[PDB]
RNA sequence: UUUUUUUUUUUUUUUUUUUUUUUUUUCUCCUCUUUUUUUUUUUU
């Protein structure tokens, strides 16, 4: 699944591949698919650093 | 000589029922005068 702002495809699929702001947006919420996440990993760890956006 | 990112129109449907017009009041109440009562009869 794909959960790009711009696009989205099968939201209900087993992996997920979104960008950074709406894991926070799914942790607001509850939306009940914290309960079965086995990893959760991120591939940019750098952006710590950035000025607006860390 | 002005880059990068910020998801979206609630889920559900394959439940049983063996009655019958109406419907419920109003009190006792001084009748004036020629009479017995005429009468057959025939033409419809």
Redesign the pocket.
């Known amino acids: 699944g794909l959960?790009?702002?711009?696009v989205?495809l099968h939201?209900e699929a087993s992996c997920l591949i979104?960008?950074?702001?709406?894991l926070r947006?799914?942790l607001y919420?509850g939306s009940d698919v914290i309960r079965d996440l086995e990893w959760v990993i991120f591939d940019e760890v750098h952006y710590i650093n950035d000025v607006?956006?860390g």
């Open positions: 959960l790009t702002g711009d989205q939201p979104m960008t950074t702001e709406i947006s799914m919420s607006e956006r």
